[model samples]
Target: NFESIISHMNDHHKSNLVDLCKKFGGIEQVQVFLKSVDFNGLDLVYENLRVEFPKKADENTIKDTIISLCMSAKSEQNFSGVEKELNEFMLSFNSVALATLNANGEVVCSYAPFVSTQWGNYIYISEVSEHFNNIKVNPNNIEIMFLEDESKAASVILRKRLRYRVNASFLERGERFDQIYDEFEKQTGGEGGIKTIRKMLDFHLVKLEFKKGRFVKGFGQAYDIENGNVTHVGASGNPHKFLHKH
Candidate 1:
């Protein structure tokens, strides 16, 4: 299957083959290419169609294209549900409570407006902020919590919240920094204090890499997210105990 696709590319798009392979690192880097995009189902179609119809010369070639298109469509539909749920959870709140260890080893919690991307969650904090200073000394441990507002809670005991224990660090200044900074501005409508003071050198962009976390849907509905898998557990109070002990 891969061979056919490679041959087709070599015959028809020879001028672009070198650049395409380089972009993806090599001709066989399908998984790597897929990870770089939001919707990668279409990439499967492209590779399949190249094999099924190396040249657009007959009716079977046309039929092969249509079949490949349908396959991609079905693949995308199945993946959309998971993406929707994750996005809804991450974007439900504009602010999250961050807990960091102070210089004295005491845990302190503070709130900051945040934005979510495919990689992780980001927040801009002033250099003078206590939490920022705390992280400067220790970047290994941080906790961020997103809780549904009490006003929107259907039941106090069943309040929805996602707690993440993350590896926190400052994002270095570079192309990635520029892209995320611009994205943050766009996501927040550029209307907050961030927009007014973004030019100040004291503000730093921080990222939290998700390590492991628990999601509580209610009293008896809890799930643990680790290594990109969601596993159900007992009630909210002590889900980890249930997961690890029972």
Candidate 2:
């Protein structure tokens, strides 16, 4: 089993070993070799460190433990061109999970269908939901979220998120309101998510101006969405240095 385990990991998962060292070892070992596998832990060359499984590993559980380690590992794999991924990820979601403060000072959470636009994010929210009035009471601070794909994805590290911590302002019925409403109609009209709500004059059109927000793709990937510009690929996203556990 040691021989079987050694070669497969040594040959194929060389980079993942680097991640293992970064995540578990707390030191960056750019070049890593899986030299030995025993019941206790993995012994590596180059960095020359041994990272043990959290629990004891027997032949029955060792492989699975190793697999689990890598699945949750923080990888430095940079999928640049974040905008390309960001665009597709944005288009895939029809609605957002909204959070705002209520009159009780408790946070009210709700979901509303929205349109992502060059100007700002637009939501056709109803007064019935507390978040609608919550937005009115507190115009400057609101959060809307679009989550990563779940059906087609398996990585629990996290899903890609387009989270907007934005300023909320409602659009009164006017030419501009009608124009933006058309944008919403085209986005979620047919089978998208809205039908009767379109006819209802009572629903409010709220524009969300992003102040600053955080976007996470998965393990070891994060970005800061700043300013009011939603479509700018030029922002060059910011990531926090990975915090290591002692």
Candidate 3:
């Protein structure tokens, strides 16, 4: 079974091997080979580059795996599906209510739904956009906020609202952005989304740290905050309310 798969790769999937090497392995080349194959990923003769799988697979879905990886290498962000609605929850590609605070005053737009970790968050928004100008002015407890969408949150009017307070710092545009934006590449399903946006001159990978979070249930309702600040607040309410805390 593996032999046939390898040969098929050996026979047909030549450039894909090259693409994987260039994209993931950092081994750029006009040529390459499929040295071997398994459920996990493939290997190449050049630089011994190995393309690995997201997870292990069996015969039923191995084909899906190969095509996905190949397409991903060629720039096709292949993330999907609860998974769907939830990712859809994020990737609904919605905008946050951000204030650019430019010469124009507080303007708005959006970025990465979130590749947040315990350290902080990552957002890839356009430099020309109000979002970047605001971030450039620096984190005055960045007021980029979001309310749940109508289709998903019945509280479209008010309930279960969420937004994180971020200390928006611009990521210097070399090694750091190069290394981390892969998450952006994966987050938006593939190259088609973030990857495509990345090549643009006006976009940026902004790093964010959290301070606090608050939730507004009614008009002047209570809040639920957590994490050690200079940290976390995956919640929603206005910046003015963060001071209230009650």
Candidate 4:
């Protein structure tokens, strides 16, 4: 069935890795960047969900795959329980889903809710604040640390911070902000969409990574909602906690 499904999707393919390489720059550059990624040990969920980038797939192909996956689902008239599975998938990826970039090179904001539904409640507020603080310094380099339950004990996962970098040279600050606002409008279908602020932030990070073609790395903790402060409770409650096993 998997092979058949792959074949069917291949038939709908409108692009491929080679085409994407040419459009984005080159295959060599893309390959090098892909190799630089580690994904830590979360490959299992990614692969199971069929979301990992294929070895020879290009950007367009990947994009099409994501959209195609959704479209095909709709065309099949199988909406029942689709949201639940999709929601879970988004949650597993830290509760965020990215929007497909429009032809004008602008992004839509509706993409954030997917991430918020899964991880928003669990997010440590203070930890996020500190992470934002670090992001403000360079924005290009930022990372967030999350704690997860492991077989042996609680384990920590590190994710690179990402965000879209609009070219500010041409547009005035007001114009840029307007464009961002419009993008959000397009994403959420209105001002009310602003309600999904938390999810929007998460989506921003994903967009940033996709735009840059690599995951940027750095460190910060998520604030504990209950504790009202950033908390680091990994191996020993510090940066070097992972260095020496408990």
Q: lDDT scores for all predictions?
A: 0.59, 0.70, 0.56, 0.29
**Better by lDDT, candidate 4 or 1:** 1
Which 10-residue window in model 2 sums to the lowest lDDT? 229-238
Candidate 1 segments whose C-alpha is farther than 4 A from its true place: 1-86, 235-246
Clashes of each: 0, 0, 9, 12
* Two-way TM-score contest, 1 vs 4, winner: 1
Of candidate 1, the 10-residue stretch with the lowest lDDT total is: 32-41
Q: Candidates sorted by lDDT, descending order?
A: 2, 1, 3, 4
C-alpha lDDT (0 to 100) for residue 220 of candidate 4 = 25
lDDT of 3 by residue, 1-246 (tens): 778777887788777776666655554345577767777777667646666665567889887878766764563322322123332333444345554455546555554345653334677777566556666775664754545655554244544344556677777677667667665555556644556677887776677664555544332233344553222122232223221122
3 or 4: which has the higher TM-score?
3
All candidates: TM-score: 0.58, 0.67, 0.46, 0.22
Residues 169-206, model 1: lDDT tens digits: 78877777678777777777778576667677888878
What lDDT, from 0 to 1, does candidate 3 have? 0.56
Candidate 4, 1-246: lDDT as tens digits: 134434443454324322322222212232211111121210111012122321223433443443433342221223324334323433343423223233344433322221232111211112233332333334333222221223322223433322222211111134343444444445445555353553443323222321222122212222221212222222232233221122
Question: Candidate 2 local accuracy as lDDT?
Answer: 0.70
Model 1: colliding residue pairs:
none
Ranking by TM-score: 2, 1, 3, 4
